[PDB]
């Protein structure tokens, strides 16, 4: 644990990137989190929503 100050910064940045990547898996109330699934399943009036 001698080099914990640099490793803390590295872990925080990697964890922020992992959270930002993980947030793509959430649909945020939509029917799916995948854009290709919505664009291949729905007409543009409801795919817009």
């Amino acid at each position: 644990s001698a080099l914990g100050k640099l490793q803390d910064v590295v872990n925080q940045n990697a964890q922020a990137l992992n959270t930002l990547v993980k947030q793509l898996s959430s649909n945020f109330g939509a029917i799916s989190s995948v854009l290709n699934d919505i664009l291949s399943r729905l007409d543009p009036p409801e795919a817009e929503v």
Partner: protein, 50 residues
């Protein structure tokens, strides 16, 4: 069948042409909810039930 004993049929291991369902004018109501009616020929499904 009647609505209290509504008949459920499994559809599996077939290639389905839904374009004859959209282009037919015999249906008074043809309303899809989670999918566009014109994209049904472009997708693959399982657990299809009528």
């Amino acid at each position: 069948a009647s609505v209290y004993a509504w008949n459920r049929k499994r559809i599996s291991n077939c290639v389905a042409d839904y374009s004859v369902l959209y282009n037919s004018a015999s249906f008074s109501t043809f309303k899809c909810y989670g999918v566009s009616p014109t994209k049904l020929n472009d997708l693959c499904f399982t657990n299809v039930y009528a």
